[PDB]
Amino acid sequence: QNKRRYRKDGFDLDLTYVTDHVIAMSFPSSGRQSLFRNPIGEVSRFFKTKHPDKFRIYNLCSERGYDETKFDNHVYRVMIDDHNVPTLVDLLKFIDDAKVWMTSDPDHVIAIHSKGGKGRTGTLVSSWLLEDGKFDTAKEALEYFGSRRTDFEVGDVFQGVETASQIRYVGYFEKIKKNYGGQLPPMKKLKVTGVTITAIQGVGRGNGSDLSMQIVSERQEVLLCKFAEGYNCALQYDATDDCVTCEVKNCPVLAGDIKVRFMSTSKSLPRGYDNCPFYFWFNTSLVEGDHVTLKREEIDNPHKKKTWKIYRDNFTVKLTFSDAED
Numbered sequence: 140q141n142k143r144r145y146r147k148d149g150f151d152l153d154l155t156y157v158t159d160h161v162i163a164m165s166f167p168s169s170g171r172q173s174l175f176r177n178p179i180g181e182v183s184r185f186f187k188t189k190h191p192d193k194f195r196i197y198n199l200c201s202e203r204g205y206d207e208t209k210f211d212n213h214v215y216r217v218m219i220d221d222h223n224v225p226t227l228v229d230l231l232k233f234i235d236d237a238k239v240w241m242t243s244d245p246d247h248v249i250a251i252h253s254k255g256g257k258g259r260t261g262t263l264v265s266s267w268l269l270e271d272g273k274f275d276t277a278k279e280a281l282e283y284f285g286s287r288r289t290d291f292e293v294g295d296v297f298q299g300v301e302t303a304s305q306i307r308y309v310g311y312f313e314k315i316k317k318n319y320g321g322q323l324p325p326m327k328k329l330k331v332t333g334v335t336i337t338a339i340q341g342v343g344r345g346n347g348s349d350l351s352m353q354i355v356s357e358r359q360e361v362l363l364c365k366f367a368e369g370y371n372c373a374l375q376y377d378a379t380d381d382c383v384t385c386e387v388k389n390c391p392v393l394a395g396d397i398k399v400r401f402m403s404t405s406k407s408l409p410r411g412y413d414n415c416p417f418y419f420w421f422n423t424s425l426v427e428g429d430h431v432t433l434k435r436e437e438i439d440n441p442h443k444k445k446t447w448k449i450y451r452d453n454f455t456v457k458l459t460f461s462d463a464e465d
Contacts, residue, residue, distance in 0.1 A: 162250035222412035303442040304420035324424035333459035343405040347383035355398035411440030432457040
């Protein structure tokens with residue numbers, strides 16, 4: 140916790156200099172309370188005294204804003220839901236905004252914040268560190284963020300802080316910078332035609348009968364499948380292989396950033412983040428072949444070790460696609 144709180148020069152804030160010019164911090168909260176929160180008046184005072192006319196604040200909270208005149212109108216908003224990811228368009232828009240600001244003056248600083256300054260903040264700080272060339276791999280940037288912000292040490296396995304999708308999206312940016320020259324990859328239109336879950340035993344009813352699947356595009360449900368009932372689908376349970384395979388029916392053309400949520404009627408399947416047992420994000424342009432397969436540690440919620448009694452080491456989810464291009 141010594142890395143967590145800034146305690147110098149009469150300040151007391153959950154604020155971390157990730158580098159000399161890159162700051163990660165928690166939400167500048169209303170009121171004067173300072174127990175596990177950063178009072179907005181004090182955060183305003185920090186940047187006005189320590190970085191006068193040389194700061195830019197990034198608010199990554201879709202859920203909450205504030206009076207941005209308190210920061211002299213130097214606030215940029217990225218609308219990210221807690222425990223989720225920015226769109227690739229929004230991530231790249233942020234990256235360009237940061238790069239222009241940082242290039243004009245060596246003494247300029249960026250302060251990225253979310254609610255706790257963990258997952259969402261780690262997503263954009265790691266992406267920026269790749270952009271600025273401090274690291275060439277997403278893994279290296281993320282682990283460095285963990286070492287500065289949390290009690291993580293470089294050498295041990297990377298766990299906590301970011302979600303699996305948040306990790307994936309930093310990886311997406313690396314691929315964008317390396318293979319696409321920092322440009323958004325060409326639009327790819329797809330339709331989901333099947334879902335396959337392995338190691339289904341012990342997951343809810345253990346045969347897919349409790350499960351439902353929601354596809355979300357641009358903050359709207361575009362499809363809902365209910366497995367046992369045949370609601371926009373056709374479930375098959377393979378007891379011998381310990382797997383379920385489900386034909387996905389009536390999926391509309393999907394493009395961009397897609398959120399897939401799996402829900403259960405069975406209460407014996409706990410809810411982690413996002414009010415469901417498991418979920419994930421992917422971008423259609425970054426899909427390779429006719430499928431995407433995600434291991435346990437690549438899915439949001441099972442990526443946590445506390446759930447590993449239910450989601451085993453061979454638990455995977457695979458989406459099969461069809462080409463929706465003209």
